Each structure stands twice: as structure tokens, then as C-alpha cells.
Write an enzyme that holds these catalytic residues in place. Structure first.
Site: not given
Lengths: 96, 96
Positions: A54, A65, A69, A85
Site C-alpha cells: 500500500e 494521511r 491509497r 480507506h
């Protein structure tokens, strides 16, 4: 299940940034970039531990953050985006 | 991202003044000089909170602080100029 394919051009511009870093193996902005993604909830196909990694896609304006991703697998161009997420994932199509 | 490097001699003369004040630790003309720059929009490289600080570059004639700034980073020689109120940045090269 992977919820479809998404064109790279349709994603936030920072996704392109992340893919360019993955291609060079960094250097990465976060120390958590490149850790193994465990695929705990089996949303992505089941593989041996270590198959998936990731990487952060920066969200401008976020204080953390954030939730975006890219997850890589070992096959060529096997790159998944999540903006939530790890709840849902799309395969990235880099050709559009 | 940073839009390249620019020689100090190619920037307004007021930028040289500001850099001289940073080197002496002031005194600075504005109360906001030296506050932390959050880099909220992720235009500059991601760093810890407090890595970046902001300083005014005076605009001649302006009643207000205007739109010119230097942002310092903690690294040696790491100073960025913006003339557009944080939309774009250039790295300052003090050697030319």
C-alpha cells in the site's frame, strides 16, 4: 470484489503522482508507504501475505494521511485505487 | 510541486532583504513573520508540522502584506519564494 475499473484520468491528480513514485521505488513521502496490505476483509482476491503493498495518495487539505491509497499486486499493472480507506477498490486503467 | 529554481539575483530586491533578516533572526517588520506554514494544500514536499515557516517579502507601495513570501524549510539552503500568495513556489538559489 473489485468494484470495476477506473481510468487514471478520472482519479485525483495525486494518484498519478503515487503511481510515478511506485514506478521509481520512491523515495516516498510517508514512512508507511510500501508496507504490506494484509487484505483482512478479503475484498481483493486472496493471495499469500506479502503479495499486496500500500501507498498513500495525498489528499490536499487533509490533516492526516487521509483515506486514499493505491494497493499494488505482483502482476503487471495490477494497481487498485481506494478512496474510502479500503472499503471499496477499483482496478486502475492507465490507458484512459 | 515546486516550479524550479531561481537565482536570488533574479528575484525582487526585497527577497534579499528578507533572507538577510532570516539569517539574523530579525527583527522582522510584520508580526506574522516567522509563524509556521502548514503546507495544507501539499504544494511543497510533505514534512512534519513546524518544518516550514513563512516570512513576508515586502511589496513596494502596498498597504497590506501583499502576496510575496519566503517559506523556509529546515534543510540547509532550503528556501522557497512565492509571488502569488502560495499558489506557486520556486526554490531560491543564493549562489547566483
Amino acid at each position: 470484489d473489485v468494484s470495476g475499473t477506473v481510468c487514471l484520468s478520472a482519479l485525483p491528480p495525486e494518484a498519478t503522482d503515487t503511481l510515478n513514485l511506485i514506478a521509481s521505488d520512491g523515495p516516498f513521502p510517508y514512512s508507511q508507504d510500501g508496507v504490506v496490505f494484509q487484505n483482512r476483509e478479503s475484498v481483493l482476491p486472496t493471495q499469500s501475505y506479502g503479495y499486496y503493498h500500500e501507498y498513500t495518495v495525498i489528499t490536499p487539505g487533509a490533516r492526516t494521511r487521509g483515506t486514499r491509497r493505491i494497493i499494488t499486486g505482483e502482476a503487471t499493472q495490477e494497481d487498485y485505487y481506494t478512496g474510502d480507506h479500503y472499503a471499496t477498490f477499483s482496478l486502475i486503467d492507465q490507458t484512459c
